[PDB]
Amino acid sequence: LDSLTKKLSTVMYERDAAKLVAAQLLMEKNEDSKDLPKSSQQ
């Protein structure tokens, strides 16, 4: 019971931790688009 709860806890923590990687990554990827688009335009 408790030995599985350790796996549950470590996962959920690391999941939402890994989830924040995406939030960061997505906004930087987005920044690269408008930058290049507005530059390639002119």
Partner 1 sequence: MDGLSFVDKPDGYKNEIDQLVKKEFANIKADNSVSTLTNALYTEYLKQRNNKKRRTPDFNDDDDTLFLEEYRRKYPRIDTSRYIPNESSEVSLLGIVDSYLKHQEIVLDTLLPQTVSNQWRINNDYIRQTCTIVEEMNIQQRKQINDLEIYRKRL
Partner 2 sequence: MLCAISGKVPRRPVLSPKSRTIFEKSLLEQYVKDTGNDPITNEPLSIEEIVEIAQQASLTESIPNLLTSLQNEWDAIMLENFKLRSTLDSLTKKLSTVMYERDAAKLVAAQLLMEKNEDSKDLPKSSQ
Partner 3 sequence: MCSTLCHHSLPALIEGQRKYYADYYAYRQEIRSLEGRRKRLQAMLNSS
Query: How near is the Cβ of 10 to partner 2 at its closest, in Å?
Result: 9
The tokens for 3 are 């030995």
Q: What is the DSSP letter of 1?
A: -
Considering only residues 4, 6, 27, 38, which one is a binding residue for partner 3 as defined by CB under 8 A?
6
What character string, x for contact with partner 2 (CB under 8 A) and - otherwise, covers 6-25?
-xx--xx-xx--xx-xx--x
What are the angstrom distances between the C-alpha of 28 and each of 9, 22, 38, 42? 29, 10, 16, 22
The tokens for 42 are 């002119």
User: What residues make contact with partner 1 under the rule CB under 8 A?
Assistant: 16-24, 26
Residues that bind partner 3 (CB under 8 A): 6, 9-10, 13-14, 17
